[PDB]
Design a protein around this ligand. Structure first.
Ligand SMILES: CCCCCC/C=C\CCCCCCCC(=O)O
Ligand SMILES: *[C@@H]1O[C@H](CO)[C@@H](O)[C@H](O)[C@H]1NC(C)=O
Ligand SMILES: *[C@@H]1O[C@H](CO)[C@@H](O)[C@H](O)[C@H]1NC(C)=O
Length: 116
């Protein structure tokens, strides 16, 4: 039911187990791993200490045996991250990615993670 996380940067987080498809709809960890690399400069810059967790919880969501669904981030965390990191993307010609639209997440804990 609940496969371990083969993706490198999400490794020693709060949680160590996942279940595809993720909150982007993709079925393969190798895909998520690829789509995470695009954010490495953003992580390097440190616009938000919650960015790594937030991104991991989206692309490689928490799986527990007790729950049937993948557990992503609470909208609140997303908002906080977006507030800190969206300006960094805009100054370089980009925007907040659609796949990270805070509307597609539950507000507070529907169950979700709120932080580390
Ligand atoms: C996903 C967020 C991206 C963060 C914003 C990008 C930051 C700097 C962009 C500089 C682009 C130049 C890349 C250098 C190319 C090279 O060194 O070969
Ligand atoms: C992560 O998984 C290991 C086993 O793979 C487990 O022992 C550990 O409790 C998990 N993490 C946390 C925070 O419990
Ligand atoms: C976020 O989701 C809402 C609700 O579906 C949608 O109206 C909105 O267009 C999405 N975000 C963007 C930037 O389009």
């Amino acid at each position: 039911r609940c496969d371990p996380i083969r993706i490198s940067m999400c490794q020693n987080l709060g949680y160590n187990v996942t279940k595809m498809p993720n909150l982007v709809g993709h079925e393969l960890q190798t895909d998520a791993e690829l789509q995470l690399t695009t954010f490495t400069p953003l992580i390097q810059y440190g616009c938000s200490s919650q960015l790594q967790f937030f991104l991991c919880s989206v692309y490689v969501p928490m799986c527990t045996e007790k729950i049937n669904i993948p557990i992503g981030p609470c909208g609140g965390m997303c908002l906080s991250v977006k507030r800190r990191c969206e300006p960094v993307l805009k100054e370089f010609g980009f925007a907040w990615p659609e796949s990270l639209n805070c509307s597609k997440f539950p507000p507070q804990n529907h169950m979700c993670m709120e932080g580390p």
